Amino acid sequence: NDKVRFIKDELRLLQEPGSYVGEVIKIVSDKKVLVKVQPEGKYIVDVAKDINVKDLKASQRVCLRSDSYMLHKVLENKADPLVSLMMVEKVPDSTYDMVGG
Amino acid sequence: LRPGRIDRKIEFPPPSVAARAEILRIHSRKMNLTRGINLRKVAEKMNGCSGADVKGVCTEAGMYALRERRIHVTQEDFELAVGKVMNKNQET
């Protein structure tokens, strides 16, 4: 029955405007986080009441809500390669046995 | 060149017959081979080859095996692989 009730109540969730995509840059003591949206500009929003600014840092992919324009949760971090071209190789496979003579 | 920047200067000697003998078996260790070949005889025909030329012989070793449609690499492929690599170094 709960599976049937959740599907019939999905119409309210489908009509929700959704959320944007942005990255965290810096924070302040006012609980206002700086979110940089890739297609759009930058927007300073308020963190959720269930979270705080202690778990937020620079270069963090998060979820920015649409209608209320506030932070929801944290998605993922920033990838290892940065800027234009960044070569990151940790613990290669080359050893002394691979080099003869 | 003056001290204070580079504290150690290592001179790399060019590969030799005894040097390329142990290098040839390492690059060929990742592919199929045949015990009927010789490690120091193949490197003896090559003279003045760099480390990329040794890997080129190993890389081209499996190319000639695809023409005969066989899963093994005999002495016939090594003789054709060296002749192709030696021509690339003497060209240009």
Added chain:
Amino acid sequence: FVSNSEILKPFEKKQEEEKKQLEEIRGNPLSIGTLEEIIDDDHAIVTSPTMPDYYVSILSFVDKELLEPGCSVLLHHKTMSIVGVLQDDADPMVSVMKMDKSPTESYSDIGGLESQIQEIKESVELPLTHPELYEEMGIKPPKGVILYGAPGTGKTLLAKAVANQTSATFLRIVGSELIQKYLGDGPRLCRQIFKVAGENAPSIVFIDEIDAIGTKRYDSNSGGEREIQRTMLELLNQLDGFDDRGDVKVIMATNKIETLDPALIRPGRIDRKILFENPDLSTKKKILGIHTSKMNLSEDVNLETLVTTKDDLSGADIQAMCTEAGLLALRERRMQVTAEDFKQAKERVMKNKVEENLEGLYL
């Protein structure tokens, strides 16, 4: 009781009413943008990262002095009005800038140069540490010093000890980084160098190893000979045409400064010309004891013995033998370095490591 009613009571009442207005003032999204220009009517124009254009009125939480063309401010969602100015923290632009705070250096390791130290200390460290000498006398200290001499004299450690005692901002500009691939970025870089150094403290400007424009040598960066003047004259106009009271101290040093344009040296602003030569047998005895102070030496090793063997060597050649002697004993892993390691180390430095040319010789 009486004062708390006239101080704490009206203050807490205004702060609670101000926070209630912050919800209507500062919205949820709080869009931002780039400020272009301001007008005396309290109206400005701000451009968001999406490149729009708007004209609104300047609201509270900002003044006329805090507004500068080219800065970033805070906007509003529906009305697009300016909420206030947003200061820029965590360095102005670049985080890899050579600016540091109180590095580790002393005057004991630079010993032997005191003849050349007295000139640079009075023109740099003295006005910063004791400003009452130049201000009360009426003289104006020079705006910078320049160094010249043979390579290997250790001209880098001369200005390194200044940053520790002055306890101020210390900047470094590589002479090879002065130019840029894109034409026009040369003066744009040098303009930002003096801009950052001029905002916070007199500080220090130290430029070392200038290969710029000298005997070409860069074929991957093409200036067309026109970028040569625009990049170099930018450093000249900042040391002459730029208005300054003598706070900015710019130091330039490299192997040979004679190949540079003497007009770029700007004579009369730099009153200190310091020359460096090879030390004698008396000075090398003090320099050798510095590098061997933290080193464990055997009983048979004598400091006066190695100095006698040293012939035509600079300060960098002495440290090379102490480093090489430590590596020779490192292979055998000995606590105290014996005398046989110093004998083999001093021979390899002056032979393979140091290549002694004839230059001017005529025996």
Added chain:
Amino acid sequence: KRIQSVPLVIGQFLEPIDQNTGIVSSTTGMSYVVRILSTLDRELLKPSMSVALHRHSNALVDILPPDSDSSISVMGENEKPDVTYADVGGLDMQKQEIREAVELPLVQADLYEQIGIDPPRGVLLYGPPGTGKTMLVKAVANSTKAAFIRVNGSEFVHKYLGEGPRMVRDVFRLARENAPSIIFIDEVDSIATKRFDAQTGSDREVQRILIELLTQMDGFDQSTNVKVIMATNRADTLDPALLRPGRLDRKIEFPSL
């Protein structure tokens, strides 16, 4: 699932996040995070799979079939064959190397696993421009008679910002559906150059066009069932980073004089 039934915004899937929740990228350029419809599943789609989005809310509605739209979608055969391989002589030296690195792995993929040799994921071409590089590729398309994709190097550039990178990933998706697929890019040096990569403050980056080339090729070709053929002018023009291990190692130069 039938609530919408009306015009929908074309989306593209990116990464899974939560159960019945995923991030999507609309063709409008603005990425949104919505919830996956209950009748759908995260396993029924692909990381690069293109989906549909609601008109206003941009919520996920229906998953489009595994085919995309760039230009004509390039089915690959319309009146294509004209000449054959026998009509061009003298290239038999370079023709044998291409047929072994292109036509051979598409037929028997187990030959490389037995000999222990990693087949190149594609083949480049070098030498003086304006002579060859169109003769050998045309002979392979007629001899193989399979999926073939011919897209110009500068064709990936679109008048819209976000449309450029979206059309790059859409080419590799069509090659994954049909196993004997050959991707051909004529004059790739337009979007791939030595340095020159930073466009500074003109529009965004434009490096993303090159980033998608390195991202899609390095993440795909796990079964080595897709090969990419590119033509250029000289070697000094192309990005030298393309010859590193882990990506295409093939180098073929047209003999001069």
Added chain:
Amino acid sequence: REMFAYAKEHEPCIIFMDEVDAIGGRRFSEGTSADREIQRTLMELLTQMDGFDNLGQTKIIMATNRPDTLDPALLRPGRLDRKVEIP
């Protein structure tokens, strides 16, 4: 691509070129202050006369003040077959 789009519609069409000193040259990419628009412009003129698209009813008349300012790749056969000199 818009000009050559009318070749398949109207078959008896001949597209001219008027005194090209710029987009006909080679000028590979080193620096050059983001020339990619002109760089890709050269790639389009070398596309329609190269790729598998077949027309045969469309002629390309290109006029210039000197052959040295033109891309040597464009001067190769397969694109400009006959060079008519007007001394």
Added chain:
Amino acid sequence: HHTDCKFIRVSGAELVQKYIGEGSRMVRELFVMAREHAPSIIFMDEIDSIG
């Protein structure tokens, strides 16, 4: 590999870009990448012309 480090190359061709404040930052930007991660062992690429 034996030192358990992160191998990072240096391409001197792309180290010079043009931005606002980042123009000359890209040259020495690789220094910061070796700060946050101590096991660097920076390697140099694109040495000279081999022909």
